Design an enzyme around this catalytic site. Structure first.
Site, PDB file in Angstrom:
ATOM      1  N   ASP A 180     -23.892  24.148   6.527  1.00 41.37           N
ATOM      2  CA  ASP A 180     -24.888  25.191   6.533  1.00 41.37           C
ATOM      3  C   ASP A 180     -24.976  25.901   7.813  1.00 41.37           C
ATOM      4  OD1 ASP A 180     -27.721  26.405   6.057  1.00 41.37           O
ATOM      5  OD2 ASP A 180     -27.412  25.024   4.349  1.00 41.37           O
ATOM      6  N   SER A 225     -31.129  26.063  -2.648  1.00 33.85           N
ATOM      7  CA  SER A 225     -30.918  25.604  -1.465  1.00 33.85           C
ATOM      8  C   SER A 225     -31.822  24.358  -1.214  1.00 33.85           C
ATOM      9  CB  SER A 225     -30.973  26.611  -0.382  1.00 33.85           C
ATOM     10  OG  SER A 225     -29.998  27.483  -0.326  1.00 33.85           O
ATOM     11  N   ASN A 276     -29.155  31.287  -7.004  1.00 33.10           N
ATOM     12  CA  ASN A 276     -30.608  31.917  -7.152  1.00 33.10           C
ATOM     13  C   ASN A 276     -30.501  33.405  -7.887  1.00 33.10           C
ATOM     14  OD1 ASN A 276     -31.244  29.809  -5.443  1.00 33.10           O
ATOM     15  ND2 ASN A 276     -31.025  30.903  -3.659  1.00 33.10           N
ATOM     16  N   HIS A 320     -32.457  27.882   8.081  1.00 31.00           N
ATOM     17  CA  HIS A 320     -32.045  27.399   6.743  1.00 31.00           C
ATOM     18  C   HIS A 320     -31.399  26.074   6.510  1.00 31.00           C
ATOM     19  CE1 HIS A 320     -29.290  27.366   3.112  1.00 31.00           C
ATOM     20  NE2 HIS A 320     -30.262  28.049   2.552  1.00 31.00           N
TER      21      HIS A 320
END
Length: 279
Positions: free
Chosen positions: A39, A224, A161, A69
């Site tokens: 990530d 996520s 998404n 994130h």
């Protein structure tokens, strides 16, 4: 063990019903397992990680998470308050820059890095990788995820998404990894969650409280956020000896809460991750 006033997603993964707020789990808590968070990095100094998080690789000028994130996702895997597997070891691999972007070549290198790097770590209960990232279909990205899985790592990936079929996204569309859709606190498919036959499981993804950079916390939404619930669950179940890296996705599907989500398109699994913990 019982954590009162837990984030709703933690309570959900240990419950046969929505609408409760205590998380129940075996005190082993993923001890002896390892989860790689591939990530934007992890703020390992956050008190919530208790010294159990570390950066092991970056492809950029810093290994620090300048975005948040990756820290949020890592918190859902394994932070003391916000995490599923509260005693796992967390390893950060920074394949995304501080704007949250990354080239597929870097992401592929990061996956092959984890497949090798686990041999440099002590993970007697097993190894998991959480990939809250993706883009358009790429056979090379899917193949990298397949290699990582084949090497003995439970790979959990975000479905995406786009409110679209995940078959057109990578690594979501790789059949051999665990592709995770998102649900909300009322057991509805999250409005943005991808769907399709390639999904293996749903996890909590709307309004998920977790760690953030600057020693902070916040609630955000996405596939996520669902992915690290599943990654942490796998680590927890592997520590219990109930499953293995090669079989954990299937075991999670076997033991999921079934038929309880709304707005699941015909042909997508109606399965919600569940730890089956009996206190």
């Amino acid at each position: 063990a019982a954590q009162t006033n837990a984030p709703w997603g933690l309570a959900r993964i240990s419950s046969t019903s929505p609408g409760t707020s205590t998380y129940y789990y075996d005190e082993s808590a993923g001890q002896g397992s390892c989860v790689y968070v591939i990530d934007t990095g992890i703020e390992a100094s956050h008190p919530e990680f208790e010294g159990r998080a570390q950066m092991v690789k970056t492809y950029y000028y810093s290994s620090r998470d300048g975005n948040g994130h990756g820290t949020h996702c890592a918190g859902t895997v394994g932070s003391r308050t916000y995490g599923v597997a509260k005693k796992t070891q967390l390893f950060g691999v920074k394949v995304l820059d501080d704007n949250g972007s990354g080239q597929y070549s870097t992401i592929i290198a990061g996956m092959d890095f984890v497949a090798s790097d686990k041999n440099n770590r002590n993970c007697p209960k097993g190894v998991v990788a959480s990939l809250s990232l993706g883009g358009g279909y790429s056979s090379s990205v899917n193949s990298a995820a397949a290699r990582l899985q084949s090497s003995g790592v439970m790979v959990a990936v975000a479905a995406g998404n786009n409110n679209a079929d995940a078959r057109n996204y990578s690594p979501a569309s790789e059949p051999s990894v665990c592709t995770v859709g998102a649900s909300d606190r009322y057991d509805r498919r999250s409005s943005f969650s991808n769907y399709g036959s390639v999904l293996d499981i749903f996890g909590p993804g709307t309004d998920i409280l977790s760690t953030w950079i600057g020693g902070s916390t916040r609630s955000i939404s996405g596939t996520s956020m669902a992915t690290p619930h599943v990654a942490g669950l796998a680590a927890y179940l592997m520590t219990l000896g109930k499953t293995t890296a090669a079989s954990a996705c299937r075991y999670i599907a076997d033991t999921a809460n079934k038929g309880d989500l709304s707005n699941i398109p015909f042909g997508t699994v109606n399965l919600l991750a569940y730890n089956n913990y009996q206190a």
